[PDB]
Design a protein around this ligand. Structure first.
Ligand code: CZF
Ligand code: DTP
Ligand code: DTP
Ligand code: DTP
Ligand code: DTP
Ligand code: FE
Ligand code: FE
Ligand code: FE
Ligand code: FE
Ligand code: MG
Ligand code: MG
Ligand code: MG
Ligand code: MG
Ligand code: MG
Ligand code: MG
Ligand code: MG
Ligand code: MG
Ligand code: MN
Ligand code: MN
Ligand code: MN
Ligand code: MN
Lengths: 466, 470, 466, 470
């Protein structure tokens, strides 16, 4: 065993196989990618990287699976099974690009609309590259793993499929619930990031993962074995999803963290055609195509920000000038927030068209960022997809609907938030943006912006509805 | 000279020598012997803390905020006279909590003396006059530029409210009445202290940042009266604070077992009340329930009385002592389940007494035996949203205050701001008994069209098919 | 199992037998005795009681013994053995009197010189009373304990003996090292109180118990099986004993905490002849004799402070008047601190005589408190009684002397601290005390008091040596 | 207007708009890309923090203390001019740390350019002039009542020392030179920030309370110069701080493996140094080691350069890239053991280079292969006790300062205040090799009459009987 001191979880023992996986270029890459990306430029505590998140997630994947094992030997959880879950935990974020979510969430979508690609599809490919380029496949056999079976089981824990599961049977289904839970989103990923992000952000966590594990249990639920919580834990589960939403409001969708993410993303776009990254057999790739070669994607990290800022080639004057505007803190100015009304959703189809709606300023000048906020399952209540159990009858699982819990829980479980920033920064400009934007809200029958009477005194009498 | 003290929540805090004089008196040191969460200690073993240390934090934070407004806004004319008076209100605001704090004013006195209406604050004010008077403080206030006729009023009114309705300070210094206990919307430093401190000791983490709130607080004209205001951006965090609070009540302050221990103690006190003399003003003897009428005698009434009873041997207390032993041994009245009203049924305080009778009545296939505890849960203002009573302000226009309705914030905020929780416990404890209670109770829920109890299918297999509606 | 949320250790599972032991008058008594006693009147965070200390100690006793078990199955640690250690942990402080250490350390010694008695001799008798008065002896058999053997083993874990051990063999000796370690004082008692006292005091702990357990191991050391630490942990062990000493300086021997302890102790003495406590078969006992009947000692708790203060019988005017002087904060005034020199120890024989030496003020007026400060083993280095082990040879234990560690470790491992307080409080009085006291130091060739030139300007030129 | 920022160590901290102007420059934002503990991150995975956030805390604490003295003692004449200058020194005091902070000024530059003497502070001062000059700050200082001729000196001198030896402020404002970097005894707010922050991120708890120290600090005449002083009672806590520090160096800052990673990087840089151009003032190209001579070019030199190398493909860097890959794969040079000199043998900085040769020489029954790292460990002032250079004061006489020698404190304090630690690593890694290293090294210790290595009987069974003295 090998012990390592993570400040969130303490000293954690790593099995020598997990150490072999860790000490590879593919994994040590996560030392150079920030967890909250743009957040560092707002919360100066948030220097943490995906490397240390990736270790906690592995650690907690083990905690929970040993715990179920101990509490319930009848499950036949093997040391083979425990290792596989730990490995999924470790490798589950292997595929995050530069600035984590900025890459898969803003950059790739703008830079290559033609693909569907997510840090997880990346986490799985990077995992194959890791295994293959570092002779791990042998070492797994060495500790009683069976690669044909287990690499599948690991790949499927991360992403989902590829009864839909080649890796383990319906009798070991609860193992697919640990690292990334499609049934309801209650995963140890969240547990680690809540604790860790709060630690570094300087916000306190309200959610006790240790307690949840104490009360977990595996029960039959429709000829599949799911994980279950004590009946009394249900309150705490609604709170976790609140905590999460609360983290996004305060930190992960901070109005300025987001505009920094956006400014970097634009600089990358300005640089993308002109930056070659060396891959498999010397083939040159661009920042946006590098996700198609894991040799080259290994090299793509937060470094590239500085590669750009510290550059001197004039075909990058474009992108370098943006990034200097961050160093000097000329950000694009925020104009305001608003929300749709009644039953108006906003198609991902239409995001690109929204500045045009907002326009004398040109719409090239506006940015409009549309943020979906849910409890993980779009419109659905994820607690409606959790199985609970009583002290009296510890194997008889049950359902608990919202109305057996409280009336102070939310009526809707998902909303949209629209935020307008302006790229022209002066007071003449920014006033204009503020009048356009407030009339836009009134035109679309969106909400009066919080600041709306103050920034737009002559426009909020336009709407009786305000 | 100043005096430093190390509170583990707020750190080293400087006490003005007047505040030290107030502290070092029998009336205040009394708070060392009263637990903040009372019955909570017998469920959350971390919760040894007493009102003494809460009372210091609240004073400390009362000062923090009032110095802060002062600094940020000199135009407010906040004097060292004013700052002291707020600090003193903070310190003395819980002076009147009885044994086990809330159990006393919330369960005991109501059952033991229906004839009075009385609350730890009415007590905090009387105990404050006693303190001032019995310890020659009145001189010492003049000594630091306080004016007792004016300022003892101002202090008394910060604690309770009145007695423009305020003799103590004008409409131009109204924001000072918002610090220690906020009637406008409940956003007070009392909460801030207890959140931090109760979490510390309970072993829950706090999600609410008081330090941040103070940084963005500011005083603005709102209807020709000067109120405190928050930045527009803080509004999210305020909805969260009231959630945090409600969350604390669910987890800890209304814990099903903490509550039944509170109730068992309260019954033991009732059993002992007729038979325990407490010596007051001029040797007059008072009972536990009448001691609230004499602050000399109420000074002596503390958590001690639990042990005075348990360790006694007088047989007129076999009654109460036997209850309290049943806590030591952990024969509690057994919890049966929880349920909630439906549609828009509230439950009149009129009808609480009648509820066990109802439970005995149910006919699935005595009421002296049942207890039924009705717990009202809100965001402080019964049915109202307290954020709808907060004034915010923009970065652009820092004096122009504004309102922010729920709809400008989120759709994931609560639809209702107050609910009821009904809990049935049974005083007969065995397996034959407790099964019965579980059948009665579940048919009762079905009869009243209340919610299926979460555990309802498991404890009452043959009765939750009675309701199609479940 | 039964879970309970201690804020120091988290949610901890209690075996149903341990719950039965806990839910008794003898144990719930610890809810009404403060851990740091007089400390509460200086550190207002320090409301904590021995009840919750007593649970942590049990919890940690289990942690460590499960851990050795897991790491080393060859030890034959049984569930019988684990329970017994947990029970010792739980019951090890059962015998603390009112204000914990004030009782066994100041009161009983002054009030009954004729006995030798310590909270542990009490912890063992109170344990027999608990077992006997609550039908536990049956319930132990029920979970495979063997009372004749195991109550001995428990009693011996707490106190020591009664190869000197009837409870377990030389092959299970490492179990006697967990709750109270005579070999070197490295016990989980310390671990719990460091963490807990710091939590409540508002001082931070510097010592990581979790890490120590990760590196513990059992090795042969002279045909007895001792617990051993990794070689690298040795630094951290010297630090723990420092942390401890550091806690005593700041908090446990605070000049004012101590004088409050002393004032209470005097009030008790004033009240002792006149307070009857009801024991076995109605026999009446005094506060000082109550340690001779566990029925009556069950009733003796911090309550007695208030029983006195709130009393009205005039044969207690004496003691009640003292306790009011604490409420009002008329403490006896502190005069100063000093230390012996060369090789002058101060016999416990001579403590009573010291005020006489200090004396116009009478010596009835002075108090002189002599505090011994060590690393647990009087003059000895306790690390010189710890066995370590290398990564290379995990069973070959070894010794590590101070000079293989550092030159910044202490030259001596024990010292004395003498503190003079005066019971007459005014400025005329207290000046006098300050001149007496400083001449006293010069007469005994003790150290110049830190404040000595300032409080005694005309006396510190008396000594050339200063 | 003020600007608030949430540092997780100190909370929400208000930044004066001048400080914000200084912060939002290439020279300062550079500190976002330099890790505080450098190689430490590859052992303590929590230690992602950078000098940027340390640099903010140090500024924050520089202000705390100087406002505090001001409040407590108006007679000192501390102006808003003075407070700003100290805050700015705090902010800019680490501006000159190179890549991996201490690895750069402590290992790299010394090996790479013997010809210069240079330290992150000489760099912090030059980078400060560059910042001021390249970003029109000089105007903005006049704007808030600073006087650049005087104040840029005062700032430069707070950071480094001189250039009564101080042009920036008189002997009557000498206590201001004690805040950010204390030559008198090392008791600075730099330490306070790094203790709290490094512990936070390392996963160690701090034992040292800076908040308390500030509460009891006070300025007194000491030899017709005004120094800072501590209460008499604080002295215990000061010995503990210097212990805490030494304790941090043992556990973390000199961790046997963190150090060898620092060394491996340093060798990779050396391998790359001749072959990497960094563009400075007027297009002039500079090497990693010469970049410290041009602040335009040194602005660009950050931790980036590690990855610039690792991700490169130019074959003149096969050298350095191959080393850095050996870190990614965790082929470190293997650690062999630790030992210490004996009696009163120091080890001249003269002789460090010669030590591998000695280890190859030992004849138990090549030196290009060994590395030998000599680590000096003190309480900041080589052989001196820094408490012997602190002025204390009594409650009775708050202006009369005094000395407190070790003997008035304890006998459990350290006999010596500085020691040496010698560590041998071997660059050849296999079992045949590493055994050999372990025999050479243990005979070496016995030859020099150094201490038996703790692991010495186990790694060298046939050699620790060579010494009777063990
Ligand atoms: O007045 C108090 N009432 C309390 O309820 C109290 N609880 C804790 N403390 C702390 O105890 C220290 C020493 O006590 P204290 O200062 O009264 O004794 P002392 O020997 O220092 O005498 P002096 O400083 O008054 O001359 C003080 O600095 C306080 O922080 C209290 N002080
Ligand atoms: N005293 C300490 N307290 C807390 N954490 C520590 C301490 N010393 C080291 N660590 C951290 C750094 C690492 O993340 C982890 C393991 O460090 P360490 O015990 O130094 O292992 P190592 O691999 O260097 O030892 P070994 O010689 O056993 O291989 O713990
Ligand atoms: N070393 C310490 N670290 C943290 N808190 C401490 C320490 N020592 C004492 N305290 C706490 C306990 C009290 O609540 C508060 C005051 O203690 P202390 O400074 O010793 O006051 P005191 O009244 O004894 O000093 P004085 O000599 O001023 O009378 O700080
Ligand atoms: N939500 C919570 N978060 C943290 N601690 C909690 C929470 N709820 C309760 N606790 C504490 C109080 C107790 O010390 C311990 C156990 O409480 P709880 O789960 O309420 O057990 P219980 O015995 O009342 O449940 P059961 O019905 O299973 O018997 O945990
Ligand atoms: N809800 C929160 N809780 C704690 N810290 C927060 C929260 N929101 C933001 N922060 C942190 C991040 C920053 O470091 C600092 C400032 O954030 P914020 O108040 O949102 O500044 P801002 O510059 O966006 O406001 P403004 O509208 O004044 O420009 O506080
Ligand atoms: Fe993740
Ligand atoms: Fe209160
Ligand atoms: Fe103990
Ligand atoms: Fe620094
Ligand atoms: Mg190792
Ligand atoms: Mg997920
Ligand atoms: Mg004092
Ligand atoms: Mg209130
Ligand atoms: Mg229970
Ligand atoms: Mg011990
Ligand atoms: Mg801003
Ligand atoms: Mg320094
Ligand atoms: Mn992921
Ligand atoms: Mn109140
Ligand atoms: Mn003990
Ligand atoms: Mn520096």
């Amino acid at each position: 065993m090998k012990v390592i001191n993570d400040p969130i979880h303490g000293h954690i023992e790593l099995h020598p196989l997990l150490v072999r996986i860790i000490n590879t270029p593919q994994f040590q890459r996560l030392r150079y990618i920030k967890q909250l990306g743009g957040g560092y430029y707002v919360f100066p505590g948030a220097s943490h990287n995906r490397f240390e998140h990736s270790l906690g997630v592995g650690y907690l994947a083990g905690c929970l699976v040993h715990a179920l094992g101990e509490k319930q030997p009848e499950l036949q959880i093997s040391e083979r099974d425990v290792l596989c879950v730990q490995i999924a935990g470790l490798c589950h974020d292997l595929g995050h690009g530069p600035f984590s979510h900025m890459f898969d969430g803003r950059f790739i979508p703008l830079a290559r609309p033609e693909v569907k690609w997510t840090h997880e599809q990346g986490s799985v490919m990077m995992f194959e590259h890791l295994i293959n380029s570092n002779g791990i496949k042998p070492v797994m056999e060495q500790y009683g793993l069976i690669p044909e079976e287990d690499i599948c089981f690991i790949k499927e824990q991360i992403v989902g499929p590829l009864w839909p599961y080649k890796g383990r049977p319906e009798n070991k289904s609860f193992l697919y619930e640990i690292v990334s839970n499609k049934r309801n989103g209650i995963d140890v990923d969240k547990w680690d990031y809540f604790a860790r992000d709060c630690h570094h952000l300087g916000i306190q966590n309200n959610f006790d993962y240790k307690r949840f594990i104490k009360f977990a249990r595996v029960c039959e639920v429709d000829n599949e074995l799911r994980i279950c919580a004590r009946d009394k834990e249900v309150g705490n589960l609604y709170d976790m999803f609140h905590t999460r939403n609360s983290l996004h409001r305060r930190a992960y969708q901070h109005k300025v963290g987001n505009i920094i993410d956006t400014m970097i993303t634009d600089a990358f776009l300005k640089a993308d055609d002109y930056i070659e990254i060396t891959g498999a057999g010397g083939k040159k790739y661009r920042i946006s195509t590098a996700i198609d070669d894991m040799e080259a994607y290994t090299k793509l990290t937060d470094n590239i920000f500085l590669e750009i800022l510290y550059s001197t080639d004039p075909k990058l004057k474009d992108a370098r000038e943006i990034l200097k505007q961050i160093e000097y803190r000329n950000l694009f100015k925020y104009v305001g927030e608003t929300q749709p009304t009644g039953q108006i959703k906003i198609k991902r189809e239409d995001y690109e068209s929204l500045p045009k709606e907002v326009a004398k300023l040109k719409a090239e000048d506006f940015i409009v960022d549309v943020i979906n906020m849910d409890y993980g399952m779009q419109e659905k209540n994820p607690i409606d997809h959790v199985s609970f159990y009583c002290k009296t009858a510890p194997n008889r699982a049950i359902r608990i609907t919202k109305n057996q819990v409280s009336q102070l829980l939310p009526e809707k479980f998902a909303e949209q938030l629209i935020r307008v920033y302006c790229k022209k920064v002066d007071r003449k400009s920014l006033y204009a943006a503020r009048q356009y934007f407030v009339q836009w809200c009134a035109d679309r029958n969106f909400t009066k912006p919080q600041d709306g009477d103050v920034i737009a005194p002559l426009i909020t009498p336009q709407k009786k509805e305000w």
